[PDB]
């Protein structure tokens, strides 16, 4: 028996990027042309890429040609597949199989395969923010809490840029959901809380989302 061991596969976002790799055991890849194959949710096998013995010639299936790059390491026995700007239909199990035979030739089938690794390309390429008020309970503090937006960045202004003094817009934090969240605050005179209107202008160019939120006492 001989073995191949795919790694790196998981959840992805459309127009995002991932890299797969395949290790091996009981054999050396330095003799073999190495191939990537996938099984789509529709159940059919698609060939994806190959790279020759001696790393000479690299070839691709026409759905991934130009978008993907195949790579190899003949010494530690690893193969790689960069997947730049993935499509929703790049969702598949991705297998790494060796072109091979007991005696090798200038043309053979795939005589050993690894168990395959799942890749899912979720269709949400950009997510637009939610915006929530940070309500002011001398000097008072108020703000806006931008949340659940992808990718960065978000820009925030206050009163269309007329209110700049005392404003702090914080660096975003990356949540364990894979989505970003930032807060923008401003300190102002407590006396102005009844008359002055405070509006934070949240712009998210990647989703083409603009939100104007008025922040007022509860």
């Amino acid at each position: 028996e001989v073995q191949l061991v795919e790694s790196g596969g998981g959840l992805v976002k459309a127009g995002g990027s991932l890299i797969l790799s395949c290790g091996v055991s009981n054999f050396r890849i330095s003799a073999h042309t190495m191939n990537w194959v996938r099984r789509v949710p529709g159940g059919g096998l698609e060939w994806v890429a190959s790279i020759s013995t001696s790393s000479t010639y690299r070839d691709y299936a026409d759905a991934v040609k130009g978008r993907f790059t195949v790579s190899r390491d003949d010494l530690e026995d690893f193969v790689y597949l960069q997947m730049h700007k993935m499509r929703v239909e790049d969702t598949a199990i991705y297998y790494c199989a060796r072109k091979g035979s007991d005696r090798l030739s200038d043309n053979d089938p795939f005589d050993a395969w690894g168990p395959g690794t799942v890749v899912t390309v979720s269709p949400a390429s950009t997510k637009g923010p939610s915006v929530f008020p940070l309500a002011p309970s001398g000097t008072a503090a108020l703000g806006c809490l931008v949340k659940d937006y992808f990718p960065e960045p978000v820009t925030v202004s206050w009163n269309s840029g007329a209110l700049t003094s005392g404003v702090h817009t914080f660096p975003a934090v990356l949540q364990s959901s894979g989505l970003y969240s930032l807060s923008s605050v401003v300190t102002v005179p407590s006396s102005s809380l009844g008359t002055q209107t405070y509006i934070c202008n949240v712009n998210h160019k990647p989703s083409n989302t603009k939100v104007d939120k008025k922040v007022e006492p509860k």
Partner: protein, 213 residues
């Protein structure tokens, strides 16, 4: 460039049946075909490394043929082990292409789905998530369609389906579909229904419930 025209897309049979499958190249190749088995979610296994040319260690029940354009695979009395997918491959020096695999499956008469709908448990709902489940308990063949409607509004994009492979005692398929909604959105509507079509049904089947009733 070559495309493989494998036929049928699904073959129905049973233990001890001799079966034949056929891959037809869209333009001629020099007998560069090979054939694989694939069990669900597994790696494929190579059976035949050139047309009619069986790989060593492969069970003797397997066979095939090739004519430079038309090709076959054949199994000499199926075992319960053989009820998997089979794929043809055309392999060139630095590329390959495969047939849309012939799924081999255990045959029976057509059977319509028993449909059941489950509301979210109160215990799930208090946590803030509502998962509504639709069960097609047993049917044959595999191909069925389920759609969700909330307040008679056809839903789109908020459900995930999985099918169990053939049952060990009756060889039917079964499907379940999970409609996912936050507690907020779920309490916004009353009726939650699933509508089913299948080979055995003369009209769509709908199961529904009213939230809170």
């Amino acid at each position: 460039d070559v495309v493989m025209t494998q036929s049928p897309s699904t073959l129905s049979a049973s233990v001890g049946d001799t079966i034949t499958i056929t891959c037809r190249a869209s333009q001629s190749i020099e007998t560069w075909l090979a054939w694989y088995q694939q069990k669900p979610g597994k790696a494929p296994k190579l059976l035949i490394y050139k047309a009619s040319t069986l790989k060593t260690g492969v069970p003797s029940r397997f066979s095939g043929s090739g004519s430079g354009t038309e090709f076959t695979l054949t199994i000499s009395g199926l075992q319960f082990d053989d009820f998997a997918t089979y794929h043809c491959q055309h392999y060139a020096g630095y590329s390959a292409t495969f047939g849309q695999g012939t799924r081999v499956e255990i045959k029976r008469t057509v059977a319509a789905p028993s449909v059941f709908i489950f509301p979210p448990s109160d215990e799930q709902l208090k946590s803030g998530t509502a998962s509504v489940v639709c069960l097609l308990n047993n049917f044959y063949p595999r191909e069925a369609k389920v759609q969700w409607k909330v307040d008679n509004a056809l839903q789109s994009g908020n459900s995930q389906e999985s099918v169990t492979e053939q049952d060990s005692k009756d060889s039917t398929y079964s499907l379940s579909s999970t409609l996912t909604l936050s507690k907020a959105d779920y309490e916004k509507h009353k009726v939650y229904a699933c509508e089913v079509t299948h080979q055995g049904l003369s009209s769509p089947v709908t199961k529904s419930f009213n939230r809170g009733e």
